[PDB]
């Protein structure tokens, strides 16, 4: 978190633009200096941990970033004044870590500072009290999992936790359920067992072929090979066909974006606006790891087809449904 | 055979400068386009986007004789540059850099925009199927 | 005062918006006895709300073979929803999967973009960190090479896990963090890569500086995570199975270092645990979180 | 002769071109092309059962690369161009695609070292500082405050209160340009203080909001 | 059971017919390319769905480190006496403890059921 993630969080963040003249701020390399506590007079000084516990004092190492400020004022002259090592705040430090003060001191030394060599470390003395952070288990991400809901009309449903790699916290959960032999058959038009996909930032569920077309790949053949790779199986054609004819003429990519845009937010303002947000939402919110770049959504298409294909595998019984307790499906 | 014993040796040159930035055109082979049928062509950047980024619009054999849309590939020199190798009268080879990759897809004849009303008509047909019951 | 606030109050999130913030974390370390201190430090917390009517997660799943200590479970509203790690597990710290991708470039990987959609069906699809990164026609070779690589500490760290499943032909190489990993010994045919000379180098560690790093970098130990554990065949002891008779099997790939390292830091203070009833041993780990000293 | 007019000559000539994929490090070597741009010599050997195309770097460019032939089927590739004179031309159709690979030699040993040299700029790192850098200085007048002072002095706030009839004639010229005029625009026009300007504006006409705010000023009908 | 894609407009074709010759046809609704239906047969639903796994088993299962290696049944096709024997590992699990075995001899893959 100190050695690498912190530099990555400051280094990679939106540039500060504020403008007539405009002002630009760029962050550089974070420096973190050993824990130091400055007394009433203020001589900054070292804080061997024993003192911190006794004087009810938090253990924190000063964090200093470097920011360079360049201003363009329509004079076309650039003055990137550099401020270096500017206080941003203080980060808590685990004891016995590469960045603590007890790191690698031979036993005679720890004993001189009134610390115990046998003691494990790995705790934060916050407010003069040691705090241990319990590792908290999480559901695994990046994997198409198929879990079957007993009560709902969805015979099977597949989900992908969406994570983008040391970049952004929001994670999405595209679901690609099938409406086959579930709950009450009701109507749902003549078509039945239709693959349907909830998506991030939408209103009503979207038929799958449409999403694929909207990403593009309008040709119904293209959509089919992107999902079912081999056309030899007889059972496969029957399974992928009811949904294949959800409807059509949604073939213009823009038309499709509009249908999903109308299938989104609230009573649509205008097609042009509806197309704009829906167009950008699919590029970033959906499948961020597969296609972080807005361009070349080709990678996104292969993964979207994969989730549909894995749901089909569960239906035909080729691959057994997944488990929610396996410790590999947990991070 | 001549080609079965075709041993040769030439000289390659990538001129640092070119008076014709070379790119890549990309039609489909499943289409098997007869280039001989192309008496003429027009080639302009696509107007939907209302320059170097603009998709191409190719009009062959008149405005509606033949028309294709070319869409730029994501990358072309992201890891490896692409070169055009051409044979010269001196036998030596000349290499030309590929600036860009454009994908030319055969355009649907009908074109136009179906609009919300066409989508609503599909929804109305779905509603009629929903209406049927006992 | 964001990190201090969260690291003292234990609320994870902004102080103002307490709408989406969980708690029950960053609790004070228990210092009553040294054994309790170690157990408190090495603990996971499955995060399900406690009272979902069903008890699916609490039941020990079979995939906790050395991932978690089976005996150590708290008694109360937190039953089987607070587990402690076994002595030898080692959670992955996290790496960048870019180097491994460049290796497969010189090892016959076809980037998906170049590949025709048609050929995908016959061969196997490498997936990395969950993003499809291509297709390779002859799978075993990539694998056999890939393991050799992790084993000699070049491109891929020991932490990367190369899982390959024959039926679906997806070799997923996961190099992210938070994956429970168990060091396990590696055996070729029916022979131990670990050999006598190595133990001799380890015995005089003080002068020859032959560290555990050296044992791994010699390729006689590998960290087999749960995903890798799905494809492998392990032997409880070398004498028990790496010997020939009407073998239950002859393909054992990996054999375990000592089976009594599947128990944590507070069920290793108990002698003869198997002889005693299992609930009695759980009750005693709870009593140990009580004994002074 | 038109900008959107595409030359079809190459195509209609059935002109053929070759397409070759080249690694960047080689391509970086090629940006340093020897002489005019000559980068070396190609070597094509064809036999009854095999065909070998290879490239060797120029002695100068240096200070065996086997080719892998690739299929061009599935996509009819051609080469269009944009001249320095912006004229457009189709040179040919691609009759061959190929990839330059090592001679079954470079694995991840020489590669990793070229890659180690290739890394050049590692993604930055959090360095360890010694002691603590100075944070608070002793400035007397803040620099930003000193800059406004010279401007505040230069034009002493606003002005005085005189020559209202002379100001009225200037306001009337502005009123001709727009019947309703923003008060803030009038404030920019007159150096005199806003309160004095408002009194003259009230005399000429009642302020009208106009439903757009800004209390636009218009000439009285009387 | 199959599909027809419009040769040109590229769209799934549909079973249509003309009273004029009372003839089965397959037509896309996207445009008008249409062809008489050659199969003369349309939607099929099978409830029994009794499917032999011999078809499904991939031949690569032979190398699984874990699967067993009996020497009891030699390959009929090639005679290597070693094989890997696995159960269905699929649904339709009302009556299935059959033991599909597979030729392990490298490069054979005879999928002999029993
Ligand atoms: Zn048609
Ligand atoms: Zn055989």
Q: How far is A318 from chain E (nearest CA, A)?
A: 6
**Cα(D27)–Cα(D33) distance, rounded to whole angstroms?**
9
Match domain D156-218 to its CATH number in 3.40.190.10, 1.10.10.10, 3.40.50.2000, 3.20.20.150: 1.10.10.10
Q: How far is CA D21 from CA B78, B96, D24, D70, E26, in A?
A: 12, 11, 10, 10, 45
**CB-based burial, C119-132: b 16+ in 10 Å, e otherwise:** ebeebbbbbbbbbb
**Cα(D10)–Cα(D15) distance, rounded to whole angstroms?**
5
Name the DSSP class of A321: P
Q: How far is CA C203 from CA A86, C199, C258, in A?
A: 51, 6, 18
Using DSSP's 3-state secondary structure scheme, residue B92 falls into coil
In sequence order, what E strands does chain C have? 43-45, 83-84, 127-128, 131-132, 161-165, 170-174, 181-188, 191-192, 221-225, 234-235, 254-255
Half-sphere exposure of D74 (CA within 13 A, CB side): 9
Do C and A touch, 3+ Cβ pairs within 8 Å? The answer is: yes
D37 is in an annotated binding site: no
D211 is in an annotated binding site: yes
Report the run of H or E that residue A195 belongs to, with start and end.
strand A195-198
Name the DSSP class of A223: H
Best probe of the C interface among E53, E60, E89, E104, by most C CBs < 10 A, is E60
A31 DSSP β-pair partners:
A64, D127
Using DSSP's 3-state secondary structure scheme, residue A214 falls into helix
CB A238 within 8 A of CB E3: no
A130 touches chain C (CB under 8 A): yes
CB C129 within 8 A of CB C176: yes
**Cβ-nearest to C167 among E58, E65, E68:** E58
**Cα(D163)–Cα(B113) distance, rounded to whole angstroms?**
66
E103 DSSP β-pair partners:
E83
**Cα(C187)–Cα(C191) distance, rounded to whole angstroms?**
6
E56 touches chain A (CB under 8 A): yes
* Cβ separation A187–B132 shorter than 8 A: yes
**Cα(D61)–Cα(D38) distance, rounded to whole angstroms?**
9
A138: chain C residues, CB-CB within 8 Å: 47, 178
**Cα(C266)–Cα(C40) distance, rounded to whole angstroms?**
10
Neighbouring C-beta atoms of residue D37, cutoff 10 Å: 18
Tokens of B12: 């390659």
Chains within contact range of chain E (3+ C-beta pairs < 8 Å): A, C
CB B18 within 8 A of CB B97: yes
**Cα(C251)–Cα(C256) distance, rounded to whole angstroms?**
15
- The owner of tokens 């062509």 is B41
* Cβ separation D73–B16 shorter than 8 A: no
In sequence order, what E strands does C46-148 have? 83-84, 127-128, 131-132
Half-sphere exposure of C268 (CA within 13 A, CB side): 18
- The owner of tokens 């390729």 is C219
Using DSSP's 3-state secondary structure scheme, residue A212 falls into helix
A84: chain D residues, CB-CB within 8 Å: 133
* Cβ separation C106–D111 shorter than 8 A: yes
The contacts of residue B28 (CB under 8 Å, 6+ apart) are: B105, B106, D74, D75, D76
Give the closest residue to A158 by CA, choosing from A247, A227, A257: A227
A229 Cα distance to chain centroid = 29
Using DSSP's 3-state secondary structure scheme, residue B29 falls into coil
CB B83 within 8 A of CB B97: yes
**Cα(D216)–Cα(C243) distance, rounded to whole angstroms?**
101
**Cα(D208)–Cα(D221) distance, rounded to whole angstroms?**
13
Task: Compute the distance from residue E7 Cα to the ligand 1 centre, in Å.
Answer: 7
Q: How far is A325 from chain E (nearest CA, A)?
A: 20
- CATH 2.20.25.10 in chain E is located at 46-114
**CATH 2.20.25.10 is right for the domain spanning E46-114:** yes
* Cβ separation A241–E30 shorter than 8 A: no
Give chain D's end-to-end CA distance (angstroms, integer).
65
Give the closest residue to B68 by CA, choosing from B40, B32, B43: B43
Sign of CA dihedral C41, C43, C48, C52: negative
Strand pairing category for C181-188 and C221-225:
antiparallel
Neighbouring C-beta atoms of residue A204, cutoff 10 Å: 9
Name the DSSP class of D162: -
Q: How far is CA C279 from CA C193, C275, D101, in A?
A: 38, 12, 63
**Cα(C278)–Cα(C260) distance, rounded to whole angstroms?**
15
C249: chain E residues, CB-CB within 8 Å: 66, 68-69
**Cα(A63)–Cα(A90) distance, rounded to whole angstroms?**
5
* Cβ separation A317–E91 shorter than 8 A: yes
- Phi (first) and psi of residue E80, to 5 degrees: -65, 140
**Cβ-nearest to A142 among C37, C117, C130:** C130
In sequence order, what E strands does chain E have? 14-18, 23-27, 34-36, 83-86, 100-103
Report the run of H or E that residue A258 belongs to, with start and end.
helix A253-262
**Cα(B77)–Cα(B60) distance, rounded to whole angstroms?**
29
Tokens of A227: 């999902």
How many degrees, rounded to 5, is the angle at CA B81 between CA B76 and CA B84?
100
Q: How far is CA E113 from CA D3, E57, E79, E83, E97, in A?
A: 71, 11, 15, 12, 12
Give the closest residue to D143 by CA, choosing from A79, C98, C210: A79
Q: List the alpha helices (DSSP H) in chain C.
A: 3-9, 34-41, 98-105, 139-151, 196-203, 205-208, 212-217, 226-230, 238-241, 278-288
Give the closest residue to E10 by CA, choosing from A223, A158, C94: A223
- Phi (first) and psi of residue D27, to 5 degrees: -65, -35
Task: Compute the distance from residue D148 Cα to the ligand 2 centre, in Å.
Answer: 93
Give the closest residue to A311 by CA, choosing from A185, A203, A139, A160: A160
Neighbouring C-beta atoms of residue D40, cutoff 10 Å: 24
Q: How far is E40 from chain C (nearest CA, A)?
A: 29
Half-sphere exposure of C237 (CA within 13 A, CB side): 5
Tokens of A264: 């989104």
CB A30 within 8 A of CB D126: yes
Chains within contact range of chain D (3+ C-beta pairs < 8 Å): A, B, C
Residue E27 CA: which ligand is closest?
1
**Cβ-nearest to A244 among E12, E51, E92:** E12
Task: Compute the distance from residue E73 Cα to the ligand 2 centre, in Å.
Answer: 11
C23 touches chain A (CB under 8 A): no
Sign of CA dihedral C57, C59, C65, C69: positive
Domain that holds residue A316: 143-331
Task: Compute the distance from residue B39 Cα to the ligand 1 centre, in Å.
Answer: 28
Tokens of D96: 């061959």
Rg (chain D; Cα; Å): 38
Q: How far is CA B59 from CA A114, B22, B105, B110, in A?
A: 85, 20, 12, 16
CB B101 within 8 A of CB B76: yes
Using DSSP's 3-state secondary structure scheme, residue A16 falls into strand
**Cα(A148)–Cα(A192) distance, rounded to whole angstroms?**
18
Resolution in A: 4.1
Give the closest residue to E105 by CA, choosing from E90, E83, E73: E83
Minimum Cα–Cα distance from E71: chain C residue: C246
- The owner of tokens 């002891």 is C237
D107 touches chain C (CB under 8 A): yes
Largest CA distance in chain A: 84
D187 Cα distance to chain centroid = 39
* Cβ separation A221–E91 shorter than 8 A: no
Neighbours of ion ligand 1 (CB under 5 A): E 6, 9, 28, 30-31, 33
Residue E32 CA: which ligand is closest?
1
Using DSSP's 3-state secondary structure scheme, residue A196 falls into strand
- Phi (first) and psi of residue C228, to 5 degrees: -65, -35
Strand pairing category for B80-87 and D16-23:
antiparallel
Tokens of A94: 């685990």
Using DSSP's 3-state secondary structure scheme, residue D148 falls into helix
Task: Compute the distance from residue E13 Cα to the ligand 1 centre, in Å.
Answer: 8
Best probe of the C interface among D77, D97, D108, by most C CBs < 10 A, is D108
D38 DSSP β-pair partners:
B13, D34
CB D25 within 8 A of CB D114: yes
Q: Left if phi > 0, otherwise alpha if psi is -120 to 50, otherwise beta: which for A186?
A: left
Best probe of the D interface among B3, B26, B35, by most D CBs < 10 A, is B35
Task: Compute the distance from residue B93 Cα to the ligand 1 centre, in Å.
Answer: 47
DSSP D86-126: --EEEEEEEEEEEEE--SS--SSSHHHHHHHHHH-S-----
**Cα(B67)–Cα(B105) distance, rounded to whole angstroms?**
9
C-alpha dihedral over E43, E48, E49, E53, to 10 degrees?
-160
The contacts of residue D56 (CB under 8 Å, 6+ apart) are: D40, D41, D42, D43, D64, D65
Give the closest residue to D90 by CA, choosing from D81, D103, D101, D98: D81
């Amino acid at each position: 978190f100190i050695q690498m993630s912190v530099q990555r969080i400051v280094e990679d963040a939106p540039p500060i633009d504020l403008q007539p003249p405009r002002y630009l701020l760029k962050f550089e390399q974070i420096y973190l200096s050993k824990p130091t506590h400055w007394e009433r007079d203020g001589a900054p000084s070292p804080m061997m941990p024993n003192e911190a516990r006794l004087r009810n004092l938090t253990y924190s190492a000063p964090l200093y970033v470097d920011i360079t400020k360049t201003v363009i004022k329509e004079g076309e002259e650039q003055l990137q004044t550099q401020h270096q090592k500017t206080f941003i705040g203080k980060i808590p430090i685990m004891l016995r870590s590469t960045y603590c003060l007890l790191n690698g001191l031979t036993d005679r030394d720890l004993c001189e500072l009134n610390e115990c060599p046998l003691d494990p470390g790995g705790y934060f003395i916050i407010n003069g009290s040691e705090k241990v952070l319990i590792a908290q288990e999480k559901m695994a991400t990046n994997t198409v999992y198929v879990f079957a809901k007993k009560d709902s009309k969805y015979a099977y449903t597949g989900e992908c936790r969406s994570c983008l790699e040391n970049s952004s916290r929001p994670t999405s959960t595209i679901w690609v359920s099938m409406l086959a032999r579930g709950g009450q058959g009701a109507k749902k038009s003549a078509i039945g067992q239709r693959i349907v996909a909830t998506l991030p930032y939408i209103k009503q569920e979207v038929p799958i072929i449409i999403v694929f077309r909207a990403l593009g790949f309008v040709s119904d053949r293209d959509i089919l090979e992107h999902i079912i790779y081999d056309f030899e199986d007889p059972e496969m054609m029957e399974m992928v066909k009811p949904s294949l004819d959800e409807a059509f003429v949604i073939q213009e990519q823009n038309v499709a974006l509009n249908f999903i845009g109308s299938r989104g937010a609230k009573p649509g303002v205008t097609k042009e606006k509806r197309i704009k947000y829906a167009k950008e939402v699919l590029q970033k919110e959906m499948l961020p790891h597969v296609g972080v770049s807005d361009f070349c959504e080709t990678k996104k298409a292969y993964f979207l087809g994969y989730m549909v294909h894995r749901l089909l595998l569960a239906a035909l019984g080729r691959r057994e449904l997944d488990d929610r307790d396996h410790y590999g499906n947990k991070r | 055979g001549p080609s079965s014993q075709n041993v040769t040796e030439y000289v390659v040159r990538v001129p640092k400068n070119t008076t014709k930035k070379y790119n890549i055109m990309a039609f489909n082979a499943a289409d098997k386009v007869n280039f001989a049928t192309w008496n003429q062509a027009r080639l302009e950047r696509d107007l939907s986007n209302k320059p170097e980024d603009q998709p191409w619009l190719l009009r062959v054999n008149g405005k509606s004789g033949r028309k294709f849309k070319g869409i730029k590939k994501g990358g072309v020199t992201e890891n490896t540059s692409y070169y055009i190798f051409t044979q010269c009268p001196d036998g030596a080879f000349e290499a030309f850099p590929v600036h860009n990759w454009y994908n030319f897809t055969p355009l649907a004849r009908h074109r136009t925009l179906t609009a919300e009303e066409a989508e609503e008509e599909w929804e109305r047909r779905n509603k009629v199927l929903n209406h049927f019951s006992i | 005062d964001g990190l201090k606030y969260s690291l003292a109050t234990g609320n994870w999130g902004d102080q103002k918006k307490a709408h989406q913030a969980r708690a029950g974390v960053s609790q004070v370390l228990n210092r009553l006895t040294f054994a309790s201190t170690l157990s408190h430090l090495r603990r996971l917390n499955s995060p399900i709300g406690r009272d979902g009517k069903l008890a699916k997660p609490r039941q020990l799943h079979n995939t906790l073979w050395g991932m978690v200590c089976p005996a150590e479970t708290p008694e109360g509203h937190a039953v089987g929803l607070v587990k402690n790690l076994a002595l030898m597990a080692y959670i992955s710290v996290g790496s960048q999967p870019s180097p491994i991708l460049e290796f497969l470039e010189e090892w016959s990987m076809e980037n998906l973009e170049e590949i025709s959609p048609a050929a995908i069906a016959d061969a196997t699809k490498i997936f990395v960190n969950g993003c499809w990164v291509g297709i390779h026609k002859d799978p075993e070779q990539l694998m056999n090479t890939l393991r050799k690589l992790r084993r000699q500490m070049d491109i891929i760290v020991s932490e990367v896990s190369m899982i390959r499943d024959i039926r679906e032909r997806e070799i997923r190489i996961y190099t992210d963090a938070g994956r429970i990993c168990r060091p396990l010994l590696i055996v070729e045919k029916q022979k131990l890569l670990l050999k006598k000379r190595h133990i001799d180098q380890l015995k005089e560690r003080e002068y020859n500086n032959y560290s555990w790093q050296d044992l791994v970098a010699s390729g006689v130990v590998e960290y087999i995570d749960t995903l890798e554990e799905e494809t492998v065949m392990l032997a409880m002891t070398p004498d028990d199975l790496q010997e020939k008779e009407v073998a239950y099997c002859s393909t054992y790939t990996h054999c375990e270092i000592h089976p009594s390292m599947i128990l944590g830091v507070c069920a290793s203070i108990i002698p003869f645990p198997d002889h005693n009833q299992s609930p009695r041993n759980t009750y005693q780990s709870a009593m140990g979180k009580q004994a002074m000293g | 002769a038109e900008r959107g007019e595409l030359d079809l000559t190459g195509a209609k000539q059935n002109t053929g071109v070759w397409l070759v994929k080249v690694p960047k490090y080689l391509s970086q070597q090629w940006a340093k092309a020897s002489g005019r741009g000559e980068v070396g010599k190609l070597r094509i050997a064809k036999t009854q059962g095999r065909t070998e195309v290879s490239f060797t770097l120029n002695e100068d460019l240096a200070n065996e690369h086997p080719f892998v032939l690739q299929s061009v089927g599935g996509q009819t590739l051609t080469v269009f161009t944009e001249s320095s004179s912006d004229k457009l031309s189709l040179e040919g159709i691609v009759v061959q695609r190929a990839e330059c690979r090592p001679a079954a030699s470079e694995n991840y040993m020489r590669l990793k070292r070229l890659q180690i040299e290739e890394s050049s700029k590692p993604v930055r790192l959090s360095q360890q500082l010694d002691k603590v850098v100075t944070t608070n200085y002793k400035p007397v007048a803040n620099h930003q405050y000193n800059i406004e002072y010279e401007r505040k002095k230069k034009e002493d706030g606003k002005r005085a209160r005189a020559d209202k009839q002379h100001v009225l004639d200037m306001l009337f010229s502005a009123f001709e340009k727009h019947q309703y005029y923003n008060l803030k625009d009038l404030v920019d026009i007159t150096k005199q203080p806003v309160v004095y300007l408002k009194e003259i504006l009230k005399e000429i006409g009642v302020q009208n909001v106009k439903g757009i705010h800004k209390n636009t000023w218009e000439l009285k009908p009387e | 059971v199959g599909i027809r894609f419009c040769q040109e407009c590229n769209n799934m074709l549909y079973p249509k017919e003309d009273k004029e010759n009372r003839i089965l046809l397959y037509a896309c609704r996207n445009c008008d390319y249409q062809q008489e239906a050659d199969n003369s047969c349309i939607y099929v639903n099978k409830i029994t769905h009794e499917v032999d796994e011999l078809t499904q088993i991939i031949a690569d299962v032979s190398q699984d480190p874990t699967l067993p290696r009996t020497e009891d049944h030699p390959c009929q096709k090639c005679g290597h006496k070693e094989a890997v024997f696995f159960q269905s590992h699929s649904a339709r699990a009302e009556d299935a403890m059959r033991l599909y075995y597979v030729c392990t001899a490298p490069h054979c893959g005879h999928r002999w059921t029993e």
